[PDB]
Amino acid sequence: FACKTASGTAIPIGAASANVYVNLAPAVNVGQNLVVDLSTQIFCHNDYPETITDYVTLQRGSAYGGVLSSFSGTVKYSGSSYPFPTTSETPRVVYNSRTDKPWVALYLTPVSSAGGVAIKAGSLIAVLILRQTNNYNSDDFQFVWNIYANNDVVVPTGGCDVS
Amino acid sequence: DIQMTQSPASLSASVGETVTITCRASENIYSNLAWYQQKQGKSPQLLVDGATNLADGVPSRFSGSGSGTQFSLKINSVQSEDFGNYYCQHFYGTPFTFGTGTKLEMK
Amino acid sequence: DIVLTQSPATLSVTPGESVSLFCRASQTIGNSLHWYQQKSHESPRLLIKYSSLSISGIPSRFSGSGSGTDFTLSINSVETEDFGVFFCQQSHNWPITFGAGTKLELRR
Amino acid sequence: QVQLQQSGSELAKPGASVKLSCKASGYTFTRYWMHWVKQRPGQGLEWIGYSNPSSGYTNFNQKFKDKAALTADTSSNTAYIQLNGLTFEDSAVYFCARDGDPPFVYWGQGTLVTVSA
Amino acid sequence: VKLVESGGGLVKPGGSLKLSCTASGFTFSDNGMAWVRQVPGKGPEWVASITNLAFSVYYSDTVTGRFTISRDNAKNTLALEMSSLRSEDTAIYYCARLYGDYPYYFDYWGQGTALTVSS
């Protein structure tokens, strides 16, 4: 699983604490503040096709990082929405072709009216512990994607979007 | 969408003794199991977290163990005030369904 | 820190052949290395982005390969317009320290 | 102290539509999710689904996909579930609980709904 | 994509100057900036960089504690107040655009201004 981010980040296999850098994409949904799009930046595939299948399941413990400590939201992991932090484990994402398809969105539940947070570059934005599972054998991995931020855009903490 | 079997249906428990409750799953559930303690005509409560971590408030007589497919619960020196039902519930993938249940009675 | 070493410093090559140049970093980098081409007295222009991908507007005659510590930037066919200096650039950990640059010249 | 309590026994008729109650106080209602339980006497505990107060989105079960419509009132801090088209085997007691923090176990006595011809 | 640099010349050691960078043709608010100096006949040297809104500044090993770099996102300008001249600063300066992850690599390069030191 040696894929890349759209900006060109080198993602190594089995590096545990992963320093992978993505781009922020803020928007607004009803009751949701779209912090970041990992789908439109992380396009992946399988490194050794026709014999293995990349299943990714989000392992427990994961919240936001950096300055955000008591802040929680929602994850869109392959269409349907789930809470974030992890009370459970989301369903899998199938990877079976050599095609750079989108991989997931993070949303924030509004506490203020229209307020926001400033994010610096090199600050942590995801503490995501993942799990890569094959199909031939019932095994499991342990990667800690310490996802940081590249661009600095104002992610809203309120019920609307200010731009 | 997975079916899960808790074993057994019922057993007899005395005072000053040890009981074992076995929670078996088909797929290798990734340690997202919880043990729920139900009373009769009353609100149920938890015992442990993740079948490894004790919840805060109850003493250490209750003990969960196991990971993967085999999940077990050892209870020693059980007393009269915790007679009820045990529900081992899995949390891997929607739906997060309960178990069948385990019935406890006076010996 | 991290220093960049080029090999060779200078190389006079007859046009019409295929050339390959190398840049070596101090530590592990992955594939996070870039190249620049300065033909004459102007701003240098990038050729291959992240050692495997090209930039549109730059032709496919520039190719990159390798990972880890060693990299290769190759030109399959050279002519009278690509002579100049090659710059290699490391972007793994702060701060940024460049390389010397390889001068490629043509016999005339 | 965080606790839940629920409505009384409602007896009704099949084919009707009714929305139930799960009353709460003393905790932040919209920044942590809630889950639902159905109790069948002689069968056991079964899982219904979970809904968001803020976004309003709900993940259901396959059985409760068209059975229930799960909302959660942010202002009144009351967890809601409505059911239309009652059947003879739906006479049961519902339980409501919390989702979020590691523990996330806070329980109530349940809403008992029974229907007959 | 056009990049405009201003502020070059010949100065004594211990002077102070402002280098101004003006950008056009792309999105300024999504993408970082840096300054790169080049000695003629010698490899490039980096001195200063800054991230998106004005959230963080970065320098190289021999630059920290000396330079001032700032940005104005309303008028799309990058400003360098530099006041630590020595004999090694005889170089041509390009204002360049840090695209990609953690603003690392350089997308387009401007013409730059020359800066030389003499007594």
Side-chain angles (χ1 to χ4, degrees), chain A, chain B, chain C, chain D residues 1-87 89-117, chain E:
Chain A
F1 189 75
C3 59
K4 59 153 202 174
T5 304
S7 77
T9 319
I11 308 176
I13 318 168
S17 66
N19 319 293
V20 176
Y21 287 81
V22 309
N23 312 60
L24 288 179
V28 54
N29 284 29
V30 54
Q32 272 156 344
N33 295 342
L34 182 53
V35 184
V36 63
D37 284 8
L38 280 78
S39 60
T40 80
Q41 311 306 126
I42 304 176
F43 303 94
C44 287
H45 44 261
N46 46 358
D47 51 351
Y48 199 75
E50 290 101 11
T51 45
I52 209 66
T53 300
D54 168 70
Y55 297 131
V56 187
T57 296
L58 199 151
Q59 196 176 358
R60 41 167 299 130
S62 315
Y64 282 95
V67 290
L68 293 154
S69 180
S70 63
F71 273 70
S72 50
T74 300
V75 62
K76 181 167 277 218
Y77 200 83
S78 80
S80 47
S81 287
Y82 316 106
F84 182 76
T86 62
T87 79
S88 62
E89 276 197 357
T90 67
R92 66 185 183 273
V93 162
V94 188
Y95 266 99
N96 219 4
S97 72
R98 277 280 199 182
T99 295
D100 273 297
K101 66 181 175 265
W103 179 49
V104 184
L106 282 72
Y107 302 89
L108 190 147
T109 47
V111 176
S112 52
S113 50
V117 57
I119 302 104
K120 296 178 183 179
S123 76
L124 183 63
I125 62 170
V127 192
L128 292 169
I129 302 173
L130 282 72
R131 188 188 312 235
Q132 175 187 348
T133 300
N134 305 297
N135 61 332
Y136 169 67
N137 54 330
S138 178
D139 70 316
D140 48 348
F141 276 126
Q142 187 173 3
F143 312 132
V144 183
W145 290 17
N146 297 102
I147 297 286
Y148 306 101
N150 292 322
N151 44 358
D152 301 332
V153 294
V154 173
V155 163
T157 67
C160 309
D161 175 77
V162 177
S163 59
Chain B
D1 291 331
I2 181 171
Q3 59 265 13
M4 201 215 68
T5 76
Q6 186 169 359
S7 68
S10 163
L11 74 163
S12 289
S14 179
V15 63
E17 61 86 20
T18 81
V19 293
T20 305
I21 313 162
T22 304
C23 195
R24 194 56 170 265
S26 178
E27 207 73 32
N28 190 289
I29 309 298
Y30 294 143
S31 83
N32 279 127
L33 272 294
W35 284 102
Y36 296 91
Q37 181 78 46
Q38 185 200 31
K39 294 294 181 311
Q40 68 275 17
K42 194 74 173 178
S43 57
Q45 295 298 140
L46 199 60
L47 289 192
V48 286
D49 283 328
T52 50
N53 196 1
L54 266 291
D56 303 308
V58 292
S60 59
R61 41 173 169 280
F62 297 99
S63 61
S65 177
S67 181
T69 72
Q70 169 60 253
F71 300 94
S72 286
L73 192 75
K74 298 291 184 181
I75 298 149
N76 49 1
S77 178
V78 60
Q79 67 269 19
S80 70
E81 58 87 20
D82 277 342
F83 279 99
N85 271 345
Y86 289 81
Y87 297 105
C88 53
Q89 186 178 3
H90 65 87
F91 293 91
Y92 179 43
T94 296
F96 307 136
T97 61
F98 283 80
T100 68
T102 300
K103 185 68 180 295
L104 274 298
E105 295 290 282
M106 186 66 204
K107 189 254 290 180
Chain C
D1 287 11
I2 297 89
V3 292
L4 290 192
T5 73
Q6 273 95 3
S7 177
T10 44
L11 185 58
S12 313
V13 57
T14 309
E17 292 184 354
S18 64
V19 298
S20 283
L21 306 176
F22 314 100
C23 182
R24 173 174 89 77
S26 75
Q27 59 190 63
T28 311
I29 198 171
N31 50 36
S32 190
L33 184 134
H34 305 279
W35 292 98
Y36 313 102
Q37 190 81 4
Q38 186 174 1
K39 317 182 291 182
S40 68
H41 306 88
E42 67 255 4
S43 307
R45 213 162 79 257
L46 188 151
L47 308 180
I48 287 299
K49 174 212 66 175
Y50 275 105
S51 83
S52 174
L53 312 167
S54 183
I55 180 169
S56 295
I58 280 292
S60 64
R61 63 185 179 180
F62 308 125
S63 66
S65 179
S67 178
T69 49
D70 293 332
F71 290 88
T72 307
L73 193 74
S74 67
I75 308 169
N76 63 6
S77 180
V78 296
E79 57 260 17
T80 64
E81 298 293 326
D82 61 357
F83 75 104
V85 70
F86 284 69
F87 284 167
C88 66
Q89 180 254 329
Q90 57 96 5
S91 68
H92 197 86
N93 278 18
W94 72 296
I96 305 306
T97 301
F98 284 84
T102 288
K103 174 52 199 152
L104 290 202
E105 64 267 17
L106 304 175
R107 279 93 166 269
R108 198 63 47 201
Chain D
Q1 183 52 263
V2 176
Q3 285 184 359
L4 279 178
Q5 63 87 28
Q6 283 182 244
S7 43
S9 62
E10 292 94 6
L11 59 88
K13 292 179 180 178
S17 66
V18 59
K19 169 175 280 316
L20 314 171
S21 177
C22 170
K23 179 72 179 295
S25 279
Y27 68 103
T28 61
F29 192 71
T30 189
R31 63 171 300 181
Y32 287 96
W33 298 60
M34 289 55 77
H35 282 235
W36 277 100
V37 182
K38 168 168 210 181
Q39 164 79 90
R40 207 75 89 81
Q43 292 306 114
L45 286 185
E46 284 184 80
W47 194 77
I48 301 176
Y50 70 92
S51 80
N52 202 359
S54 44
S55 73
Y57 184 79
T58 311
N59 223 333
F60 298 99
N61 213 337
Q62 199 41 66
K63 174 62 157 180
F64 299 98
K65 197 48 143 182
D66 302 288
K67 269 303 285 204
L70 270 73
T71 63
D73 200 2
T74 309
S75 84
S76 78
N77 304 322
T78 316
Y80 285 140
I81 188 168
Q82 69 173 357
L83 72 164
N84 312 338
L86 265 295
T87 59
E89 62 261 40
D90 205 283
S91 292
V93 59
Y94 282 174
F95 295 115
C96 64
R98 189 175 181 269
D99 186 74
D101 221 32
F104 53 85
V105 297
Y106 302 104
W107 292 96
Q109 89 290 338
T111 292
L112 182 60
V113 186
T114 310
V115 285
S116 290
Chain E
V1 178
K2 202 175 169 186
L3 291 165
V4 172
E5 288 105 327
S6 293
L10 192 141
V11 292
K12 290 181 179 179
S16 71
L17 280 185
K18 64 182 290 294
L19 285 181
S20 282
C21 179
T22 306
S24 67
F26 65 97
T27 62
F28 204 92
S29 278
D30 275 353
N31 189 358
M33 294 296 172
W35 275 101
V36 168
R37 42 152 299 181
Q38 205 194 349
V39 193
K42 194 201 172 292
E45 281 138 17
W46 169 67
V47 292
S49 72
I50 190 171
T51 47
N52 288 62
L53 297 210
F55 285 176
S56 313
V57 296
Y58 297 111
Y59 297 122
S60 77
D61 46 355
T62 61
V63 178
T64 50
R66 310 182 305 126
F67 281 18
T68 304
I69 196 66
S70 75
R71 62 179 41 249
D72 291 341
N73 304 56
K75 64 193 315 291
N76 289 351
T77 58
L78 170 73
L80 176 74
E81 321 300 307
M82 161 285 268
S83 52
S84 66
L85 277 297
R86 65 182 181 178
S87 297
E88 294 293 328
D89 301 319
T90 57
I92 180 167
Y93 278 72
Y94 312 129
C95 165
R97 171 215 186 187
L98 293 174
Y99 185 78
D101 45 357
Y102 194 20
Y104 277 162
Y105 69 98
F106 285 111
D107 208 327
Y108 287 103
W109 290 80
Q111 303 296 326
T113 61
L115 287 172
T116 178
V117 175
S118 174
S119 58

